[PDB]
Design an enzyme around this catalytic site. Structure first.
Site, mmCIF file in Angstrom:
data_model
loop_
_atom_site.group_PDB
_atom_site.id
_atom_site.type_symbol
_atom_site.label_atom_id
_atom_site.label_comp_id
_atom_site.label_asym_id
_atom_site.label_seq_id
_atom_site.Cartn_x
_atom_site.Cartn_y
_atom_site.Cartn_z
ATOM 1 N N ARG B 72 -4.116 106.775 18.846
ATOM 2 C CA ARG B 72 -4.256 108.021 19.593
ATOM 3 C C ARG B 72 -3.384 109.143 19.054
ATOM 4 O O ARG B 72 -3.870 110.248 18.799
ATOM 5 C CB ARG B 72 -3.930 107.813 21.076
ATOM 6 C CG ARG B 72 -5.047 107.168 21.874
ATOM 7 C CD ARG B 72 -4.825 107.335 23.376
ATOM 8 N NE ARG B 72 -3.675 106.577 23.872
ATOM 9 C CZ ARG B 72 -3.670 105.265 24.074
ATOM 10 N NH1 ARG B 72 -4.756 104.543 23.823
ATOM 11 N NH2 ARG B 72 -2.580 104.671 24.546
ATOM 12 N N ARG B 146 -2.801 80.962 6.866
ATOM 13 C CA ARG B 146 -1.510 80.508 7.362
ATOM 14 C C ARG B 146 -0.820 81.652 8.108
ATOM 15 O O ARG B 146 0.117 82.265 7.604
ATOM 16 C CB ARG B 146 -0.637 80.032 6.196
ATOM 17 C CG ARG B 146 0.497 79.117 6.595
ATOM 18 C CD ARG B 146 1.806 79.667 6.085
ATOM 19 N NE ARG B 146 1.951 81.028 6.570
ATOM 20 C CZ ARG B 146 3.110 81.601 6.841
ATOM 21 N NH1 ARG B 146 4.221 80.923 6.668
ATOM 22 N NH2 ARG B 146 3.148 82.843 7.294
ATOM 23 N N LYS B 164 2.968 94.212 10.087
ATOM 24 C CA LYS B 164 3.879 94.329 8.958
ATOM 25 C C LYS B 164 3.952 95.790 8.480
ATOM 26 O O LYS B 164 5.039 96.328 8.255
ATOM 27 C CB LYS B 164 3.391 93.436 7.821
ATOM 28 C CG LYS B 164 4.409 92.442 7.301
ATOM 29 C CD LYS B 164 4.631 91.254 8.221
ATOM 30 C CE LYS B 164 5.501 90.244 7.506
ATOM 31 N NZ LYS B 164 5.975 89.111 8.330
ATOM 32 N N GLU B 236 0.474 88.208 2.269
ATOM 33 C CA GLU B 236 1.043 87.738 3.513
ATOM 34 C C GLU B 236 0.182 86.682 4.190
ATOM 35 O O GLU B 236 -1.033 86.839 4.313
ATOM 36 C CB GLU B 236 1.214 88.920 4.469
ATOM 37 C CG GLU B 236 1.942 88.565 5.739
ATOM 38 C CD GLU B 236 3.434 88.645 5.557
ATOM 39 O OE1 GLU B 236 4.138 87.800 6.127
ATOM 40 O OE2 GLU B 236 3.909 89.557 4.856
ATOM 41 N N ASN B 240 -0.473 77.627 1.560
ATOM 42 C CA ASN B 240 0.468 77.172 0.541
ATOM 43 C C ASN B 240 -0.078 77.192 -0.890
ATOM 44 O O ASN B 240 0.450 77.906 -1.750
ATOM 45 C CB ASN B 240 0.973 75.766 0.898
ATOM 46 C CG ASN B 240 1.958 75.218 -0.120
ATOM 47 O OD1 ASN B 240 1.585 74.864 -1.243
ATOM 48 N ND2 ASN B 240 3.226 75.146 0.267
ATOM 49 N N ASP B 260 6.138 85.638 2.387
ATOM 50 C CA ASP B 260 6.487 84.318 2.892
ATOM 51 C C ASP B 260 7.309 83.450 1.942
ATOM 52 O O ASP B 260 8.032 82.565 2.378
ATOM 53 C CB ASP B 260 5.199 83.604 3.284
ATOM 54 C CG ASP B 260 4.430 84.368 4.339
ATOM 55 O OD1 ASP B 260 4.913 84.397 5.483
ATOM 56 O OD2 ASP B 260 3.368 84.951 4.026
ATOM 57 N N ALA B 293 8.899 71.715 2.641
ATOM 58 C CA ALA B 293 8.999 71.860 1.197
ATOM 59 C C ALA B 293 7.873 72.737 0.670
ATOM 60 O O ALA B 293 7.326 72.473 -0.405
ATOM 61 C CB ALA B 293 8.942 70.480 0.535
ATOM 62 N N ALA B 296 8.268 78.772 2.136
ATOM 63 C CA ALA B 296 9.618 79.210 2.459
ATOM 64 C C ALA B 296 10.697 78.352 1.820
ATOM 65 O O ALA B 296 11.613 78.877 1.182
ATOM 66 C CB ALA B 296 9.809 79.243 3.958
ATOM 67 N N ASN B 402 8.029 80.628 12.828
ATOM 68 C CA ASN B 402 7.502 81.525 13.851
ATOM 69 C C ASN B 402 6.091 81.078 14.220
ATOM 70 O O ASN B 402 5.426 80.406 13.433
ATOM 71 C CB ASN B 402 7.462 82.961 13.320
ATOM 72 C CG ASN B 402 8.792 83.397 12.731
ATOM 73 O OD1 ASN B 402 9.816 83.391 13.413
ATOM 74 N ND2 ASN B 402 8.782 83.766 11.458
ATOM 75 N N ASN B 447 14.609 86.816 9.860
ATOM 76 C CA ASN B 447 13.188 87.074 9.690
ATOM 77 C C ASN B 447 13.030 88.072 8.539
ATOM 78 O O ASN B 447 13.834 89.000 8.402
ATOM 79 C CB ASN B 447 12.618 87.630 11.004
ATOM 80 C CG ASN B 447 11.110 87.795 10.969
ATOM 81 O OD1 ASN B 447 10.580 88.640 10.248
ATOM 82 N ND2 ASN B 447 10.411 86.982 11.746
HETATM 83 N N1 ATP Z 1 6.082 67.492 11.318
HETATM 84 C C1 ATP Z 1 6.693 67.799 10.173
HETATM 85 N N2 ATP Z 1 7.882 67.216 9.826
HETATM 86 C C2 ATP Z 1 8.496 67.544 8.641
HETATM 87 N N3 ATP Z 1 7.925 68.446 7.782
HETATM 88 C C3 ATP Z 1 6.734 69.042 8.114
HETATM 89 C C4 ATP Z 1 6.154 68.708 9.268
HETATM 90 N N4 ATP Z 1 5.026 69.335 9.489
HETATM 91 C C5 ATP Z 1 4.851 70.122 8.391
HETATM 92 N N5 ATP Z 1 5.923 69.925 7.537
HETATM 93 C C6 ATP Z 1 6.171 70.564 6.209
HETATM 94 O O1 ATP Z 1 6.460 71.994 6.319
HETATM 95 C C7 ATP Z 1 6.007 72.637 5.076
HETATM 96 C C8 ATP Z 1 5.114 73.834 5.394
HETATM 97 O O2 ATP Z 1 4.871 74.559 4.180
HETATM 98 P P1 ATP Z 1 3.837 75.796 4.129
HETATM 99 O O3 ATP Z 1 3.839 76.329 2.751
HETATM 100 O O4 ATP Z 1 2.540 75.369 4.720
HETATM 101 O O5 ATP Z 1 4.531 76.879 5.108
HETATM 102 P P2 ATP Z 1 5.934 77.657 5.131
HETATM 103 O O6 ATP Z 1 5.731 79.052 4.702
HETATM 104 O O7 ATP Z 1 6.928 76.860 4.401
HETATM 105 O O8 ATP Z 1 6.314 77.640 6.689
HETATM 106 P P3 ATP Z 1 6.788 78.779 7.796
HETATM 107 O O9 ATP Z 1 6.158 80.052 7.382
HETATM 108 O O10 ATP Z 1 6.299 78.290 9.102
HETATM 109 O O11 ATP Z 1 8.259 78.838 7.704
HETATM 110 C C9 ATP Z 1 5.246 71.599 4.301
HETATM 111 O O12 ATP Z 1 6.026 71.137 3.182
HETATM 112 C C10 ATP Z 1 5.010 70.471 5.267
HETATM 113 O O13 ATP Z 1 4.952 69.208 4.580
HETATM 114 O O1 FUM Z 2 1.811 111.447 26.095
HETATM 115 C C1 FUM Z 2 0.761 111.768 25.565
HETATM 116 O O2 FUM Z 2 0.418 112.993 25.495
HETATM 117 C C2 FUM Z 2 -0.148 110.708 24.960
HETATM 118 C C3 FUM Z 2 -0.172 109.383 25.424
HETATM 119 C C4 FUM Z 2 -1.086 108.301 24.815
HETATM 120 O O3 FUM Z 2 -1.859 108.554 23.867
HETATM 121 O O4 FUM Z 2 -0.987 107.146 25.351
HETATM 122 O O1 OXL Z 3 5.109 83.964 8.391
HETATM 123 C C1 OXL Z 3 6.122 84.392 9.068
HETATM 124 O O2 OXL Z 3 6.594 83.684 10.042
HETATM 125 C C2 OXL Z 3 6.741 85.745 8.748
HETATM 126 O O3 OXL Z 3 6.331 86.417 7.799
HETATM 127 O O4 OXL Z 3 7.680 86.159 9.426
HETATM 128 MN MN MN Z 4 4.203 85.780 7.069
#
Ligand code: ATP
Ligand code: FUM
Ligand code: OXL
Ligand code: MN
Ligand code: ATP
Ligand code: ATP
Ligand code: FUM
Ligand code: OXL
Ligand code: OXL
Ligand code: MN
Ligand code: MN
EC number: 1.1.1.38
Lengths: 554, 554, 554
Positions: B72, B146, B164, B236, B240, B260, B293, B296, B402, B447
């Protein structure tokens, strides 16, 4: 049609279809990528809306949500309203619209309508020329002085014309793009608004000098100069003094009427006509007492007289059956409180004794019908109601003031206190009432929404130039003629609200037929089938194809 | 200059000021009459917003309201965010954005961002050509496989890139018109979504054929063809496998990074670097165990190694201090579960005993730091937390997954079970924790929002072509160098979230100076004062004049 | 008030003022810098034009230059025409417009008008919807089969409706934006054009099947559907067969007339009416012989009859005074050549002897008036003219075929050969003629340009629905009534061409007064002063201010 392409088609609620844009429309109009891959139907969209609405709790929250759709997807907005007009009416219209206006500056998001202030005097035409639509056919204008029974709400009153026009479309299928809500801002006397940092108007008390009348005159001229002298201009929620004088001043010069005086007059009459059908009471035994003597009272009274006169009664005889009781008391010849030319015909020689309260008035006059139009609260007290039930076998009680808190009494009170013998109607909605004996009464809503939509459609389609009182008499008859015998037995004085669309169209047809019969229509060529013409002219909430015409050449 | 006038200026959120349009702007731009007579300041508008927000109850309801303002009045949207970024972050970002995403199709009102589907293969450039802005400098794209720790949400994942980028502007002052959210839709494997009638994507399972890689390639090429070879492209929430593959494939060809893998890596390192200062612990005694592993874990581990190497340790020595435990267990040489090239460096000879659970891993390895990044819920059980507290005087516990429900543990759990001796940080926000002795601990939020805004701003202003790992190492140092000793004693591992704006700018300044010193900046002429340059380039939420330049000639 | 700003205001000839845009308009509308610093007046611009025109040599070169201005600066274009309509008329109208049409495809630069081809059958509405103007009030349409006396020129004939409409504005002050030139392309039988690489129409012989009639029907419907049933539609240059049948078919259904049958009929009568006042000749003694028996001859003959009838003669008696001689000879009962219902009333029993040539016809019938309207060249030979001079003291000789090369004879020939005793008029312009005795004769131009502009204005302003023959009878009287006794003596049968603007307005005034008196006008409210109303409604070539309304608030 549609000269715009790309993002602008999505930004304009008039054309935006959301995910309803077909794949072909998206590719050809440059929208591919701007919308999710999903292609949806209007049904799916309506479902998404109802799913979300159901999870909401407050009426105002619902009002903000649905009205917000009018600014995103117009077609969907009306589809939604049309899906269940009865259940949404209380939200978009009375009583919630009254709440929305009282907090208009607080719930503001996007502006709606045309705003003309006294500071723009001498430059109204330039403002009128900024309105995007070139084919306006109808205007609903207010100055915010008499918003429902809430009083002076200034520019916050804009919610009213917006709401009324929404109903033009939803009820009578009048084209949205041909409607123009207008708010005249000459200041406000509401002390609370003058100290409200969110107020949407000029911070000054109302200008009541000659500049006020000049501005209104400039408004009327600017509107007709650009759109045509036959442009329908419906005055709405103007204060008592201005309401009448502007109606008298412009009714013979422009295509105009006042909803509060004339529209309310027609709905009230219609209800009375229905009650007469169930009671079959002699026009001679009719004694009508009005609580109030303003816009509505005088409007209703004059229409009632016109009805009695064409039914074999002299104007003088008819007027004698009507009494009025305003804030100062009973209108009787020689009273202290003022009596203008409009009230004179209903001001009679003082009775044996002079009443102090409306209750005294009911006991002294022993009226057969009581009509509340004072916009001042629950003035039809339990004692007033009991008196009517003791004096009459089937008392007629109309509590027309809006919104609900301003109503003279509730359906519950009327039906219960009269042992279910009363014929009741109100301006604001009340649910059905069940008495201890098990009988269920369904109160009708004597609100002008039953009248202005159909009358507007007929006037517009017929290119009518001026609106006589007889037009409202006809509308009143057209409304009541749609009541079925079964519905009468139910205690319904008006066709069900759920059928407001077809009721409005039928009124439109009846009025157009009346306009033609009385040389008040100017359309060429003159349609042979008036009914079919009206129905063919109505706007539909169904999506239109925005695809360019592509075809093979031999 | 503005090429539009009239209604269009109000329909475009980028220009619309609501009642903040001045009298002169309204008159000259043809808006007089389309807005209420009231002239408001952004301050009043912000007040209206906060007044309404305060009356709302659910986070999602608030999300819908604030995000609606972006469509808006963009200027007001960012002003609102800037007024109290700390209290709104949980609404527009994690955890609420996670909820928004899960129900994206249900709360849909207006589309946001660019959508490219597999069905558009071979026609991506035409979709890119439909985006209204000509000067895009940054793109955040997801394929929704993901989304946070929620899994495959398909097109519903668009909420992420949108959020983001809102932060690009709110935190780093990057121009909104220069940002482009992108959702690549190749289908989804989420069964529930495939049966959801409100789903916003193609109704097919994910296309994992060569056509997928081809589509991403076409995407990269189309974006850079139109906007330039240095256009920043932030990947983003990709699965994996694809995440790493595309990072390796495009990092030397385009200006791109994966939030990530790299963004999360930098914020995590920064937290560790801060902890380093509060406990003065010797890197030789640093024993780190990752729960997970993947994206992240590998990203963080690689950055940690670079940090230890830069501090006197050999790559091998540093990697020896890092262990990982994924869903199949501890990464050890010869285990049955797969081990790719990225994990090999952290896959050591099996210890005395092989652990079954993460708890066992903690007791057998006796790590001093535990980093949760498995996006699988409360894996840091009370017993895991107690084990860390029994083994270490000041255990470092990071639960970065998250949204909130996916976090390895809560701040309350961490501080209470370790008797306030742990150094804790989480990806999702937790309020302060008070122990029974009365001590209050304020958990920091590790984060990537503390990193991508500042890094994006630097890369954009310097016209950087490619982003090396060292750029994130620098961002990490820049972030932690912002902490004051006072804050460190408060349990602070990160600067206050309320100061995210100045923190991001400062990170942006440090990174730009790093880019210039390492011949990675290509702007001319080169500004003498980088800090001054960056601060002057930031977009401001204050309204700009839209008045045409009118003046007298001599 | 304009909805466009910036470059577009300059690219659109309707709004473009060139260097006439004021400094304030340029600054406020974003044109500063796009124009030379110089601020000019329309006078200076008109001066620049006349300066350049004066240096040109060929009429076609001038036509291309002036018509080019219509596509650059519309206001200036008409200012230029109004500066000296008499000297430019031969350039933008006959005879040069005929030359322009003959090579329309060779001098093509920008298209003008609306083109509807047979290949668009079933899609005419979409074409009509593409026209940018929303308030079209008048249409001049041709199918190019009978372009002047030049024959079938197909789409090249578009030059005619364009010229006629330029004159609607130049002569009667009709708004340019309300005019729409239309070319119906069903193919062409002109073999030369079918082999011309620059032809602008479909490469096919004319479609003479039912499809032709259906396309014309769709055209009529489409125009009125979008613009209104009373939209004036002037058929121009249609072939004989089609011209009459379409006039009969649509005259009572739509607001339409045929310029070649009715317009030309009125001008001719007007000249005859003028001649009657210079020689005071009793119409019982008037014997009229037409060279031709088509659109013009029949149209003129019918109006003449109506004139004699209202002057005391029976229809029978009046028709007997009229004879016609077409390409097959004298129209006599029982001749070999066809005679339709329109010609029947003027087909009399063969005379003593039957003539072979028009010369023979003159000598055998001894007419007092000769009207050339065969569009076949110099058929009024020196011998024909000598015969009329020996048979009559003051012979009336009209050579109305256009362009000049198609004229039955020149003014020089007529005046000299009759020793200055003839009353002459032609469709195409001829300079004054000076005889050996010193007498100077100024030939009048009996061209419909004296009629259609004034009639069109009256019909438009009166919202007239249909045009009766009587309207043209009135227009004829209105034209001749403007001649002054002094001009009669000059040999003037028509008001000076230099005064065509005021002459057209006066005709419009007389025609509207006639329309009201005969209940053929539908305007509300009805202006009390018709003359004042007409003059106030005329479009002016003076530049309008494009400045937004800017003012101070109290
Ligand atoms: N229940 C679990 N116990 C231990 N490790 C787990 C479990 N479940 C998932 N994992 C591991 O967590 C990892 C997730 O990796 P992935 O690349 O999918 O996401 P990520 O970016 O690392 O995670 P996030 O964004 O949530 O921090 C994998 O290596 C997976 O094997
Ligand atoms: O305060 C305004 O004028 C606009 C509000 C809105 O777009 O929610
Ligand atoms: O994937 C996530 O959790 C992030 O980017 O914060
Ligand atoms: Mn992310
Ligand atoms: N307390 C009261 N008791 C009796 N009459 C009252 C009372 N308060 C107000 N009234 C009367 O009600 C009438 C209101 O007239 P006004 O023209 O302002 O509105 P209205 O259009 O008639 O009312 P509404 O639109 O609410 O039906 C006045 O005649 C006023 O005197
Ligand atoms: N050579 C000729 N001699 C005599 N009459 C001719 C000759 N050539 C053509 N004509 C006649 O001239 C008439 C032309 O009629 P048509 O309807 O085609 O056009 P018009 O509108 O009457 O003429 P113009 O084009 O001059 O306005 C026909 O009746 C035709 O027979
Ligand atoms: O369902 C839609 O597509 C739109 C919803 C809205 O505008 O609220
Ligand atoms: O004013 C009112 O109450 C109405 O119009 O219903
Ligand atoms: O056709 C013609 O010759 C004309 O219109 O003047
Ligand atoms: Mn009202
Ligand atoms: Mn012609």
């Amino acid at each position: 049609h549609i000269k715009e392409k790309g993002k602008p088609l999505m930004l304009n609620p008039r054309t935006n279809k959301g995910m309803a844009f077909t794949l072909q429309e998206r590719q050809m109009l440059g929208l591919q990528g701007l919308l999710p891959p999903k292609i949806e139907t209007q049904d799916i969209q309506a479902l998404r809306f109802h799913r979300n609405l159901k999870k909401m709790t407050s009426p105002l929250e619902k009002y903000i949500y649905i009205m917000g759709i009018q600014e995103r997807n117009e077609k969907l907005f009306y589809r939604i309203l049309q899906d269940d007009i009865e259940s949404l009416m209380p939200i978009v219209y009375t009583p919630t619209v009254g709440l929305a206006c009282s907090q208009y500056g607080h719930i503001f998001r996007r502006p709606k309508g045309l705003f003309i202030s006294i500071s723009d005097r001498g430059h109204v035409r330039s403002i009128v020329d900024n309105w995007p639509e070139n084919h306006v056919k109808a205007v609903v204008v207010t100055d915010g002085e008499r918003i429902l029974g809430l009083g002076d709400l200034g520019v916050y009153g804009m919610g009213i014309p917006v709401g009324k026009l929404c109903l033009y479309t939803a009820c009578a299928g009048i084209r949205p793009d041909q409607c123009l809500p207008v708010c005249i801002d000459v200041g406000t006397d509401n002390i609370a608004l003058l100290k409200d940092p969110f107020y949407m108007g000029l911070y000054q008390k109302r200008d009541r000098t000659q500049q006020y009348d000049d501005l209104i005159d400039e408004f009327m001229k600017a509107i007709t100069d650009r759109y045509g002298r036959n442009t329908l201009i419906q005055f709405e929620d103007f204060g008592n003094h201005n309401a009448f004088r502007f109606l008298r001043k412009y009714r013979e010069k422009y295509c105009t009427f006042n909803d509060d005086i004339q529209g309310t007059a027609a709905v009230a009459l219609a209800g009375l006509l229905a009650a007469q059908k169930v009671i079959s009471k002699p026009i001679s035994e009719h004694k009508i007492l009005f609580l109030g003597a303003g816009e509505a009272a005088l409007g209703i009274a004059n229409l009632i007289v016109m009805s009695m006169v064409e039914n074999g009664l002299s104007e003088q005889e008819a007027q004698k059956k009507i009494w009025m009781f305003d804030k100062y008391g009973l209108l009787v010849k020689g009273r202290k409180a003022k009596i203008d030319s409009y009230q004179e015909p209903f001001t009679h020689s003082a009775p044996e004794s002079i009443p102090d309260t409306f209750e005294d008035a009911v006991n002294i006059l022993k009226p057969s019908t009581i009509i509340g139009v004072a916009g001042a609260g629950r003035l039809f007290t339990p004692d007033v109601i009991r008196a009517m039930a003791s004096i009459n076998e089937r008392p007629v009680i109309f509590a027309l003031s809006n919104p609900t808190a301003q109503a003279e009494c509730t359906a519950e009170e009327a039906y219960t206190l009269t042992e279910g013998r009363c014929l009741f109607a109100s301006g604001s909605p009340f649910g059905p009432v069940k008495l201890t004996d098990g009988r269920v009464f369904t109160p009708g809503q004597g609100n002008n929404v039953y009248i202005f939509p159909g009358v507007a459609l007929a006037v517009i389609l017929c290119n009518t130039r001026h609106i006589s009182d007889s037009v409202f008499l006809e509308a009143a008859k057209a409304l009541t003629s749609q009541l079925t015998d079964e519905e009468l037995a139910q205690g319904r004085l008006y066709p069900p609200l759920a059928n407001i669309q077809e009721v409005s169209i039928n009124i439109a047809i009846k009025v157009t037929e009346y306009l033609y019969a009385n040389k008040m229509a100017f359309v060429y060529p003159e349609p042979e089938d008036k009914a079919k013409y009206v129905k063919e002219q109505t706007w539909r909430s169904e999506y239109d194809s925005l695809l360019p015409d592509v075809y093979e050449w031999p």
